[PDB]
């Protein structure tokens, strides 16, 4: 049973739910999060939950407990996370979890075992008694985990915190067909109709899996990464961002991943270093997952000594995109191009994108770029 | 056109520019009411510009005529560019003169080595972009089938032929598509595609017009 059939369709619906929640709050904020990373982390947490607390989590991740066995869900995430942690992958994607519980708590052995074997994650004990040392400790972990990529992830720890969860992911892929750094220039990026910002714009004339969809009122571009990952970008027509974010479905996205026809185009894609940081308690709470964060939370699977609820949960995503790709600076990258004037498709205004794992088609990342030069 | 020369105003009377707010392809006038071009250049609402030299400034000899019909070859494959040929009927007949004349169709296919003239307002740089104001010209020979197939393995059909120089430096480019390849007063080819422009061992590929003379005459009669 392939990983896809166990969790992808579900991750897609989750991805959309979380995205739309953030997109409904504002049309001018940058967005970046990992559906995979966030869902895996709470699927892992559900292992220590029970009763409605447990059901509410999985049902909150768009998984129907009366259609697919909980074992399939965990086996799926296990397989996917396993592939993403492979030290030898050309993708160079690193993601991890941070489980922090107050020292002195008698932990359930079964729980810690599953978290290690199924989610390749580890638990840690910290004295929340001293809010500052606890904070330094947690950040120290993410600090060592992301090899310095993420510093001071947490900025505030409530006094009665007993359990906090940290989830992060960092990605910077290399294209199969790169851009020549020499061709990158500063260009106008239209944050809105009456405001522009200058941004380094990569550009290349070639054959691209690019086309304009009348259904989404957007140009759609697919770029393959060296490493079994594909980036797909949705450039909505003027004033059609809300339309696009509203029309996206798994079927529509899949339709694009299935078609490989290409056409000539002079592409302009902005170089970017973007991040996303979220309070999962606030976000997941709006998605129906509230009990695991409440006083009546059932986390007896984590500890039987005394009551327990998730006090803090934060997600941090980091994505970098630049010209770097394959090695063959020459005619190797010479494509057969029709000789009419090719369309100049510029990603110079707000757009949506996703990064899809090649084999499982799982949504590693989903975001929106409103202003590439500002947080 | 890369590595070519300025033709000189109206020295290539059969050359036309397809415009949709700007020049995007070339074409050849075969009779007062029909223009031959490339299928991949197809677009709706095309305005055919004849008697042009400096496509940007008014010089006095141009005739702008809308395309009433744009018939793409029924077997045109947009992925392989096989059968890359298109016929455009002018809404009204053009006024033929010394600056605007039709080029005749071939009665037999040209053989390897045949020397011809290729023209257009396409990019003039093998690297980078530079569109000219005036029409550019290039003298170039049709290459052997051997070299063509060798240059583009499994990409060349019997409806295509290469022309140019294997060493590079001289070639048609983006913006020349649809344009003519004339040999001894015969339109033997249409600029179609190529890997890069004026790149070594990567000559231009052209639609073999002689294979469509029958289709052209039949289409003109039925329209």
By the 10 Å C-beta count (0-12 exposed, 13-18 middle, 19+ buried), A6 is classed as buried
Q: Where are the alpha helices (DSSP H) in A150-189?
A: none
Closest Cβ–Cβ partner in A331, A337, A340 for B24? A340
Q: C-alpha A207: how far from its chain's center?
A: 28
What's chain A's length in residues?
375
Beta strands in chain A (DSSP E): 31-33, 93-102, 122-126, 163-172, 174-175, 185-192, 195-213, 218-226, 229-236, 263-270, 272-279, 312-321, 336-338, 344-346, 351-357, 363-369
**B23 reaches A (C-beta below 8 A):** yes
The dihedrals phi and psi of A51, each to the nearest 5 degrees, come to 65, -145
CA-closest candidate to residue B143, choices B181, B106, B173, B104: B181
Q: Which of B81, B199, B200 is nearest residue A338 as measured by Cβ atoms?
A: B81
If we measure between CA atoms, which residue out of A160, A166, A167, A165 comes closest to residue A295? A160
Q: Which residues of B touch A204 (CB under 8 A)?
A: none
Nearest neighbour of A338 by CB, restricted to B22, B177, B196: B177
Q: Cα separation of A338 and A206, whole Å?
A: 10
Residues 54-83 of B with CB under 8 A from A: 78-79, 81
Question: What's the CA angle centered on B89, arms B87 and B92, to 5 degrees?
Answer: 160
Query: From CA A365, how far away is CA A29, in angstroms rounded?
Result: 16
The first and second tokens of residue A359, run together, are 């084999």
Q: Residue B196: left if φ>0, alpha if ψ -120 to 50, beta else—which one?
A: left
Burial of A249 (0-12, 13-18, 19+ CB in 10 A): exposed
Which ranges in B61-152 belong to alpha helices (H)?
145-151
Fold of B13-102+211-223: Thrombin, subunit H (2.40.10)
Tell me if chain B has a CB within 8 Å of the CB of A340: yes
| Closest chain A residue by Cα to residue B195 | A336
Round to whole Å and give the CA distance between A132 and A129.
9
As given in the structure block, the two tokens for residue B127 are: 């690297």
Q: How far is A338 from chain B (nearest CA, A)?
A: 4
In angstroms and rounded to an integer, the radius of gyration of the C-alpha atoms of chain A is 22
Residues facing residue A357 across a β-bridge: A229
Contact of B31 with chain A, judged by CB distance below 8 Å, is answered with no
Whether the CB-CB separation of A355 and A230 falls below 8 Å is answered with yes
Q: Rounded to an integer, what distance in angstroms lies between the CA atom of residue B51 and that of residue A65?
A: 73
Output the six-digit token pair for B100. 């605007």
Chain A hits for B79, Cβ within 8 Å: 261
Q: Which helix (H) or strand (E) holds A81?
A: helix A70-84
**Are B119 and B7 contacting, i.e. CB atoms less than 8 angstroms apart?**
yes
Whose CA is closest to A264, among A306, A322, A304, A211?
A: A211
A159: how many CB neighbours lie within 10 A of its CB? 8
Instruction: Please give the backbone phi and psi of residue B40, each rounded to the nearest 5 degrees, phi first.
Output: -65, -10
Cβ atoms within 10 Å, residue A264: 21
Q: How far is B42 from chain A (nearest CA, A)?
A: 10
Strand ranges for A109-175 from DSSP E: 122-126, 163-172, 174-175
Please tell me which of the candidates A336, A337, A339 has its beta carbon nearest to residue B122: A339
The H-or-E segment that residue B39 falls in is none
- Rounded to a whole number of angstroms, the distance from the CA of B121 to the nearest CA of chain A is 10
CB A261 within 8 A of CB B79: yes
CA distance readout (Å), B223 to A259, B43, B91, B179, B190:
36, 19, 12, 22, 22
- Tell me, what DSSP letter sits at residue A177? S
Structure-block tokens of residue B149: 């197939």
- Is B181 within 8 Å of B204 (Cβ atoms)? no
Q: How far is B151 from B194, CA to CA, in rounded Å? A: 10
3-state secondary structure of A330: coil
Characterize B176-213 residue by residue with b for buried, 16 or more Cβ atoms within 10 angstroms of its Cβ, and e for exposed. Answer: bbbbbbbbeebbbbbbbbbbbbbbeebbbbbbbbbbbe
Helix axes A3-25, A250-258, angle to 10 degrees: 120
Of chain B, the end-to-end C-alpha distance in Å amounts to 33
Chain A residues with beta carbon closer than 8 angstroms to that of B24: 340-341
Contact residues on chain B for A335, CB-CB shorter than 8 A: 195-196
Question: Which of A205, A339, A342 is closest, CB to CB, to B192?
Answer: A339
Q: Give the position of tokens 């499994």.
A: B154
**φ and ψ at A285, to 5 degrees?**
-60, -35
Interface check for A334 against chain B (CB to CB < 8 A): the answer is: yes
Calpha distance A143→B187 (Å, rounded): 69
* Rounded distance between C-alpha atoms, residue B121 and residue B15, angstroms: 10
**Region class of B168: left (phi > 0), else alpha (psi between -120 and 50), else beta:** left
Which residues face B86 on adjacent strands? Answer: B37, B72
**Nearest C-alpha in B relative to A343:** B24
Give chain A positions within 8 Å (CB) of B177.
Answer: 338-340
Please report residues of B whose CB lies closer than 8 A to that of A329. none
Query: Which residues on chain B are in Cβ contact (under 8 Å) with A263?
Result: 78
Helix A35-45 crosses helix A51-60 at what angle (to 10 degrees)?
170
Q: Which of A339, A342, A344 to mutate to test the interface with B (most CBs of B within 10 A)?
A: A339
What is the number of alpha carbons within 13 Å of residue A4 lying toward its C-beta?
Answer: 9
Q: Which of A124, A91, A88, A99 is nearest to A40 (CA)?
A: A99
Q: Distances from the Cα of A347 to the Cαs of A61, A244, A270, A370, B159, in angstroms? A: 31, 15, 7, 11, 37
DSSP string, A349-360: S-EEEEEEETTT
Scan for tokens 């972990």, then name that residue.
A141
Provide the resolution (angstroms): 2.3
Q: Where are the beta strands (DSSP E) in chain B?
A: 5-6, 15-19, 23-31, 34-37, 47-50, 63-72, 86-90, 115-120, 136-141, 160-163, 180-183, 186-195, 204-208
Structural method: X-ray
Angle, CA A14 vertex, CA A11 and CA A15 arms, to 5°: 85
Please give the residue of chain A at the shortest CA–CA distance from B151.
A336
Q: How far apart are alpha carbons A298 and A214 in whole angstroms?
A: 48
Cβ atoms < 10 Å from Cβ of B141: 16
Eight-class DSSP state of A230: E
Spell out the residues 6+ positions from residue A202 whose beta carbon is closer than 8 angstroms to its own.
A179, A183, A184, A268, A269, A270, A271, A322, A323
Q: Label residue A113 exposed, middle or buried (CB < 10 Å: 0-12, 13-18, 19+).
A: exposed
Q: Is A102 left (phi over 0), alpha (psi -120 to 50) or beta?
A: beta
First to last CA, chain A: 41
Q: How do beta strands A312-321 and A163-172 pair?
A: parallel
User: For residue B80, which residues of chain A lie inside 8 Å, CB to CB?
Assistant: none
For chain A, what are the domain ranges? 4-175+271-339, 176-270+340-375
Same fold, B1-12+103-210 and B13-102+211-223: yes
Nearest to A175 by CA among A319, A318, A323: A323
* Closest Cα in chain A, distance from residue B105 (Å): 22
Q: Please answer yes or no on whether A341 and B196 come within 8 Å at the CB atom.
A: no
Q: How far, in Å, are A16, A17, A111, B205 from residue A62 at the CA level?
A: 10, 9, 23, 53
Determine which of B55, B72, B126, B174 to mutate to test the interface with A (most A C-beta atoms within 10 Å).
B174
- CB contacts of B41 in chain A (<8 Å) are 340
Residue to mutate among A334, A336, A340, A344, with most B CBs inside 10 A, is A340
The two structure tokens encoding residue A261:
């026809």
Q: Show me where the domains of chain B are located.
A: 1-12+103-210, 13-102+211-223
In the DSSP assignment, the letter for residue B144 is P
Three-state DSSP at A93 gives strand
A203 → chain B, closest CA residue: B128
| Closest C-alpha to A177, from A124, A230, A127, A219 | A230
- In CATH terms, A4-175+271-339 corresponds, of 3.30.497.10, 1.10.3720.10, 3.90.470.20, 3.40.1350.10, to 3.30.497.10
Residue A147 CB: number of other CB atoms within 10 A?
Answer: 9
| Cα separations in angstroms, A237 against A84, A352, B219 | 35, 12, 38
- Give the alpha-carbon dihedral of A335, A339, A343, A345, to 10 degrees: 20
Question: What class is the A176-270+340-375 domain?
Answer: mainly beta
Fold match flag (A4-175+271-339 vs A176-270+340-375): no
Q: Considering only alpha carbons, which residue of chain A is nearest residue B17?
A: A340
Distance CA B118, CA A312 (A): 71
In chain A, how many H helices and how many E strands? 9, 16
Q: Choose among B218, B193, B177: nearest CA to B18.
A: B177
Chain A, 236 to 265: residues with Cβ < 8 Å from chain B are 261, 263
Q: At what angle do helices A35-45 and A3-25 cross, to 10 degrees?
A: 110
CA distance A353 to B142: 46
Q: Is the Cβ of A341 closer than 8 Å to some Cβ of chain B?
A: yes
Q: For the beta carbon of residue A71, count every other beta carbon within 10 angstroms.
A: 9
**The CATH number fitting domain B1-12+103-210, selected from 2.60.40.3080, 3.65.10.10, 2.40.10.10, 3.30.1490.190:** 2.40.10.10
Task: Give the separation between CA A15 and CA A72, rounded to whole angstroms.
Answer: 19
CA dihedral A61, A62, A63, A64 (to 10 degrees): 140
Cα–Cα distance between B136 and B138 in angstroms, integer? Answer: 7
Q: Which residue has the tokens 């009377």?
A: B13
DSSP state of A62: T
CA distance A277 to A260: 34
Q: What is the C-alpha to C-alpha distance for residues B18 and B70, in angstroms, rounded to an integer?
A: 12
A343: chain B residues, CB-CB within 8 Å: none
Given phi > 0 = left and psi -120 to 50 = alpha, else beta, which region is A184? beta
Tell if the CB–CB gap between A339 and B176 is shorter than 8 Å: yes
């Amino acid at each position: 049973h392939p990983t896809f059939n166990k969790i992808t369709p579900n991750l897609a619906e989750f991805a959309f739910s979380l995205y739309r929640q953030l997109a409904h709050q504002s049309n001018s904020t940058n967005i970046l999060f990992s559906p995979v990373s966030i869902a895996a982390a709470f699927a892992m947490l559900s292992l220590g939950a029970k009763g409605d607390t447990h059901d509410e989590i999985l049902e909150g991740l768009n998984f129907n407990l009366t259609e697919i066995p909980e074992a399939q869900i965990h086996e799926g995430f296990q397989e996917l996370l396993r592939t993403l942690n492979q030290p030898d992958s050309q993708l160079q994607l690193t993601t991890g979890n941070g489980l922090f519980l107050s020292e002195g708590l008698k932990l359930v052995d079964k729980f810690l075992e599953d978290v290690k074997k199924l989610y390749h994650s580890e638990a840690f004990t910290v004295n929340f008694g001293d809010t500052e040392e606890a904070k330094k400790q947690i950040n120290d972990y993410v600090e060592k985990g992301t090899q310095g990529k993420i510093v001071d992830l947490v900025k505030e720890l409530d006094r009665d915190t007993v359990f906090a969860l940290v989830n992060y992911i960092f990605f910077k892929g290399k294209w199969e067909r790169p851009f020549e750094v020499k061709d990158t220039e500063e260009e106008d990026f239209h944050v809105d109709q009456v405001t522009t910002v200058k941004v380094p714009m990569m550009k290349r004339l070639g054959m691209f899996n690019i086309q304009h969809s009348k259904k989404l009122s957007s140009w759609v571009l697919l770029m393959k990464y060296l490493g079994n990952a594909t980036a797909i970008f949705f450039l909505p027509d003027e004033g059609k961002l809300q339309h696009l974010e509203n029309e996206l479905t798994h079927d529509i996205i899949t339709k694009f991943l299935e078609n490989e026809d290409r056409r000539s185009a002079s592409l302009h894609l902005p170089k970017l270093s973007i991040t996303g940081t979220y309070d999962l308690k606030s976000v997941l709470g709006q998605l129906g997952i509230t009990k695991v964060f409440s006083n009546g939370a059932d986390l007896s699977g984590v500890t039987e000594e005394a009551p327990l609820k998730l006090s803090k949960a934060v997600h941090k995503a980091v994505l970098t995109i630049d010209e770097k790709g394959t090695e063959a600076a020459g005619a190797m990258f010479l494509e057969a191009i029709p000789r009419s004037i090719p369309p100049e498709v510029k990603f110079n205004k707000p757009f949506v994108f996703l990064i899809i794992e090649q084999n499982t088609k799982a949504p590693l990342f989903m975001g929106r770029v409103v202003n590439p030069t500002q947080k | 056109i890369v590595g070519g020369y300025t033709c000189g105003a109206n020295t290539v009377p059969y050359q036309v520019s397809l415009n949709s707010g700007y020049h995007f392809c070339g074409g050849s006038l075969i009779n007062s009411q029909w223009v031959v071009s490339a299928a991949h250049c197809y677009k709706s609402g095309i305005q055919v510009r004849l008697g042009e030299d400096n496509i940007n400034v008014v010089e006095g000899n141009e005739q702008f005529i809308s395309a009433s019909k744009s018939i793409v070859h029924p077997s045109y494959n947009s992925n392989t560019l096989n059968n890359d040929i298109m016929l455009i009927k002018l809404k009204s007949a053009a006024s033929l003169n010394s600056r605007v004349a039709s080029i005749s169709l071939p009665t037999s296919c040209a053989s390897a080595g045949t020397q011809c003239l290729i023209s257009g307002w396409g990019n003039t740089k093998s690297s980078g972009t530079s569109y000219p104001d005036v029409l550019k010209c290039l003298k170039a020979p049709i290459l052997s089938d051997s070299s063509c197939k060798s240059a583009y393995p499994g990409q060349i059909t019997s409806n295509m032929f290469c022309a140019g120089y294997l060493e590079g430096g001289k070639d048609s480019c983006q913006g020349d598509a649809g344009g003519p390849v004339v040999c001894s007063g015969k339109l033997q080819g249409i600029v179609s595609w190529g890997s890069g422009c004026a790149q070594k061992n990567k000559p231009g590929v052209y639609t073999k017009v002689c294979n469509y003379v029958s289709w052209i005459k039949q289409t003109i009669a039925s329209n």
